[PDB]
């Protein structure tokens, strides 16, 4: 497991039923109808750079003792699609970032009328020196944040 850290597995319940794994070294992982997206999702509704999972160095609030957390890396899910995505219970519009916890099932597209639903389960097998792995530590904070020029630049690579 010197190449895979995170595992995004499209479930059978979704039009997709494959397993994609982000490499501890691949950051950010791009998702969208365009295979250019490190992750592959073919949904007529999905866009080229539908969304991407980006990794960042988790910063701690100092420590005048011996406590965990420290400074390591965290994986953020960055939605770039107009069709919006659903993560557990948090909405993310094209241009948002989100914390990805170990075993996080994210839905990129859900249509009731079409009965077609897409969702991937994030499973981290390897922890490339991750403060935890991505599920955070103490008081889970699952709130959607906005992206900046840094994020927009990442999608400008493919």
């Amino acid at each position: 497991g010197n190449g895979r850290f995170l595992t995004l597995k499209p479930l059978p319940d979704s039009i997709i039923q494959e397993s994609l794994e982000i490499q501890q070294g691949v950051n950010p992982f791009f998702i969208g109808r365009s295979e250019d997206c490190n992750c592959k999702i073919e949904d007529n509704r999905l866009s080229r750079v539908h969304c991407f999972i980006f990794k960042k160095r988790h910063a701690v609030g100092k420590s005048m003792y011996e406590s965990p957390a420290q400074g390591l890396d965290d994986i953020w899910y960055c939605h770039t699609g107009t069709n919006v995505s659903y993560l557990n219970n948090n909405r993310m519009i094209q241009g948002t970032k989100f914390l990805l916890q170990d075993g996080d099932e994210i839905k990129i597209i859900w249509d009731k009328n079409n009965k077609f639903v897409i969702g991937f389960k994030v499973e981290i097998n390897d922890t490339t020196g991750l403060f935890n792995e991505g599920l955070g530590m103490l008081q889970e904070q699952r709130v959607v944040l906005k992206q900046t020029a840094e994020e927009k630049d990442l999608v400008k690579k493919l």
């Binding site: 866009s47 107009t82 069709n83 919006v84 597209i109 859900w110 009731k112």
Partner: peptide, 7 residues
Amino acid sequence: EDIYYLD
């Protein structure tokens, strides 16, 4: 085609 919309 950024004219999509979901319920």
